[PDB]
């Protein structure tokens, strides 16, 4: 029950009225899954190669 599905990222951001451009201030980096690597990895596992 304790295990839960992926929770979202929370940020607090303030609109700037006098500060015309607020472009480069808030930049945040996240990691996304690479499905190709996951597929190449789960089909090449020590168990499967050992069985082969």
């Amino acid at each position: 029950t304790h295990l839960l599905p992926l929770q979202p990222i929370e940020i607090d951001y303030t609109v700037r009225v006098d500060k015309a451009s607020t472009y480069g201030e808030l930049v945040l980096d996240i990691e996304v899954p690479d499905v190709n690597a996951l597929k190449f990895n789960n089909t090449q596992r020590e168990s499967q190669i050992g069985a082969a």
């Binding site: 201030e25 808030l26 945040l28 990691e31």
Partner: protein, 46 residues
């Protein structure tokens, strides 16, 4: 084995943080999954 010296140096107390990570790493790493830059000196250059 390949990391038998990097592993030993990790827990003997020497190379506490930066020395070790730079020794391992071509690949890119960030210090966490989510990294937020509330304000950055170089990024405001855009």
């Amino acid at each position: 084995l390949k990391y038998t010296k990097l592993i030993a140096a990790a827990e003997d107390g020497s190379r506490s943080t930066k020395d070790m990570i730079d020794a391992v790493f071509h690949l890119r790493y960030q210090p966490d999954g989510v990294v937020v830059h509330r304000d950055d000196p170089a990024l405001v250059g855009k």
